[PDB]
Amino acid sequence: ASTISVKDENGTVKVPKDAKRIVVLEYSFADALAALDVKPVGIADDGKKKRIIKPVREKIGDYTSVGTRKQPNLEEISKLKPDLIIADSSRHKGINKELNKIAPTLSLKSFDGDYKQNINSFKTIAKALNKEKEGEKRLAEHDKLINKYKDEIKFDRNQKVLPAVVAKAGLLAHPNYSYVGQFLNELGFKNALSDDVTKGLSKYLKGPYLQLDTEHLADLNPERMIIMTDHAKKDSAEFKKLQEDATWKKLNAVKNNRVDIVDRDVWARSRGLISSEEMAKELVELSK
Ligand SMILES: O=C(O)C[C@@](O)(CC(=O)NCCC[C@@H](NC(=O)C[C@@](O)(CC(=O)O)C(=O)O)C(=O)O)C(=O)O
Ligand SMILES: [Fe+3]
Ligand SMILES: [Zn+2]
Ligand SMILES: [Zn+2]
Ligand SMILES: [Zn+2]
Ligand SMILES: [Zn+2]
């Protein structure tokens, strides 16, 4: 037997050539596998299978939950006897050793990665599986759709945007170095957050997700906003209190009718080729 050496975030990992059983510890690595018609046996899916977007979910089929992304359950991982574990370079720094005792571990950008880096992690997975060819063609299909949709989005690009989650209790802004933000940058948009106001702002779980006081909100006064939510009725008790707040009402985007509410699973959690493809289709349909 032999190996394929692959550069992960730490350094060169030795992945078995025959790698058949894969545990993945972020949704985005589950999207990468699906796009190479490879199906993992384990997913850290927060116990919530529906957080795996539709085209991925049905292309993966039936798998085993290894628990939360934040705290993957090591005995369920072990029992699955994976030939390879794809872990997040941010989320799982602390279980990296204990993952390697189970199986050779590829630590990659996901949670703290912007749009390009997540795509870089996809290429790394494809090389590790020896599917470079499929990988390039899928990306070539990807680079086409995205740019196609980019040419059809009828929003004016000069109206700066703030993408945010209203966390519980929020707000969390997604800057230019978040997945959403850069993806919007790649589509032509300018983040309302300047690459200098973000200087401070505390981070959420070490990722590019930045706590904003309602007064930071008013100061930057974005011209467009994109609020990511998990509520099917796009309601949220949390968000409705923000909409009553006098200082929210005075925002430029609120007053010029340019607030779009979208699905957080799809926009923020997924971080895959398919999910960006839905994000860009949406934005064409929202542009009208
Ligand atoms: O999860 C992602 O990949 C990305 C992202 O964390 C990005 C984001 O803007 N985060 C704001 C969420 C703040 C919110 N916390 C949760 O809801 C729990 C959790 O975040 C846990 C986790 O992630 O381990 C979860 O997602 O289940 C709170 O209560 O204040 C996101 O959730 O959209
Ligand atoms: Fe989260
Ligand atoms: Zn402030
Ligand atoms: Zn101020
Ligand atoms: Zn609701
Ligand atoms: Zn809620």
Residue 182 near residue 117, CB atoms below 8 Å: no
Token couple for 104: 């050779």
Burial of 39 (0-12, 13-18, 19+ CB in 10 A): middle
State residue 144 phi and psi, 5-degree precision: -75, -60
Neighbours of 2 (CB within 10 A): 7
* Resolution (Å units): 2.2
The torsion angle over the Cα atoms of residues 191, 193, 199 and 205, rounded to 10 degrees, is -80
Q: Where are the domains of the chain?
A: 1-108, 109-288
The torsion angle over the Cα atoms of residues 218, 222, 224 and 226, rounded to 10 degrees, is -70
Token couple for 63: 């798998």
Task: Compute, in angstroms, the gap from residue 233 CA to the centroid of ligand 3.
Answer: 30
CATH of domain 1-108: 3.40.50.1980
Q: Is the dihedral of CA 127, 5, 43, 29 positive or negative?
A: negative
Q: Coil, strand or helix: which one is 65?
A: strand
Bridge partners, residue 203, by sequence: 210
271: left (phi over 0), alpha (psi -120 to 50) or beta: left
209 CB within 6 A, ligand 1: yes
Q: Which helix (H) or strand (E) holds 23?
A: strand 22-24
Alpha carbons 166 and 173: distance in angstroms, whole number? 9
Peptide bond before residue 232 is cis, with ω within 30 degrees of 0: no
CATH 3.40.50.2300 fits 109-288, yes or no: no
Residue 10 near residue 2, CB atoms below 8 Å: no
**Residue in the block written with tokens 């007053």:** 255
Alpha carbons 254 and 200: distance in angstroms, whole number? 26
Alpha carbons 13 and 282: distance in angstroms, whole number? 38
What atom of ligand 1 comes closest to residue 209's alpha carbon? Answer: 9
165 CB within 6 A, ligand 1: yes
